[PDB]
Design a protein around this ligand. Structure first.
Ligand SMILES: O=c1ccn([C@@H]2O[C@H](COP(=O)(O)OP(=O)(O)OP(=O)(O)O)[C@@H](O)[C@H]2O)c(=O)[nH]1
Ligand SMILES: *[C@@H]1O[C@H](CO)[C@@H](O)[C@H](O)[C@H]1NC(C)=O
Length: 246
């Protein structure tokens, strides 16, 4: 398990949590020195539990699929909540079984469905450590519309930050003040599968992408990533989704 406490949180303690989260994901291989997530894991070992504590010390436990860093559901007090999708239903066979009741959320976990449920695109949802504190608090008491927004915050501040160093740094910059994600942040989130695939395809291609990946950069400029010498590959991305899952 991995843990993060919002009480006394700062950029350093958050960095330690994101390092812990990355290190809790198993891998047997690196591709261009980036951990390659496993094709599959059988049984309960598939799921990582994140213990998150809001500023007042209340806690939820979030179940993460270690193959893809996809949040499956969470436990709040004696109630478990899972996404309305088969992967989460499968996950509910292994985690939070001791919950007094289980609620299936009225949406799947993808950004599109969450944004529809939340009533807004995550372009307009501030993120940061205060937003994460709020998200935890919201998820403690069921409200599906509110939860969708909280989950968009949670996903970005945990999984996406684990996947990209740029995004952990964005959140560290928002340690004491929320701000909507940069376009670059959104671009990276949307490109994780594509980047993961092309970095793997580059292995037998002399480091060259079979298909370029278009990203937005920190200045708001749209750029093509064509090979593994790009800073996105050498510095930013920290985890690869296995092509077997793409
Ligand atoms: O479009 C998105 C948006 C978000 N996510 C990811 O969702 C994770 C938690 O949500 P899930 O992983 O459970 O939803 P899913 O994406 O498997 O849903 P389908 O599209 O497969 O129906 C988060 O870690 C985030 O990266 C997506 O996989 N796709
Ligand atoms: C590879 O990407 C680098 C960094 O963006 C770029 O300068 C160069 O033109 C590309 N080289 C090849 C061989 O594609």
């Amino acid at each position: 398990d991995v843990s993060f406490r919002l009480s006394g949180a700062d950029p350093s303690s958050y960095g330690m949590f994101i390092k812990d989260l990355r290190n809790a994901l198993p891998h047997t291989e690196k591709v261009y020195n980036i951990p390659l997530l496993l094709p599959s894991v059988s049984g309960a070992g598939r799921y990582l539990l994140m213990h998150l504590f809001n500023y007042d010390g209340n806690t939820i436990t979030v179940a993460v699929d270690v193959t893809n860093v996809y949040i499956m559901g969470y436990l709040a007090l004696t109630t478990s909540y899972f996404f309305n999708e088969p992967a989460a239903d499968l996950a509910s066979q292994y985690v939070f079984r001791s919950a007094r009741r289980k609620i299936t959320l009225p949406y799947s976990g993808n950004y599109e469905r969450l944004q529809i449920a939340a009533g807004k695109p995550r372009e307009k949802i501030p993120i940061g450590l205060p937003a994460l504190d709020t998200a935890i608090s919201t998820l403690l008491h069921y409200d599906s519309t509110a939860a969708a927004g909280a989950l968009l915050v949670l996903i970005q501040t945990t999984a996406e930050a684990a996947r990209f160093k740029y995004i952990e740094q964005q959140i560290q910059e928002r340690a004491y003040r929320d701000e909507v994600p940069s376009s670059a942040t959104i671009s990276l989130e949307n490109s994780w599968s594509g980047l993961s695939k092309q970095i793997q395809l580059a292995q037998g291609n002399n480091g060259v992408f079979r298909t370029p990946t278009v990203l937005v950069d920190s200045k708001g400029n749209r750029v093509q990533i064509t090979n593994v010498t790009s800073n996105v590959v050498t510095s930013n991305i920290q985890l690869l989704l296995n092509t077997k899952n793409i």
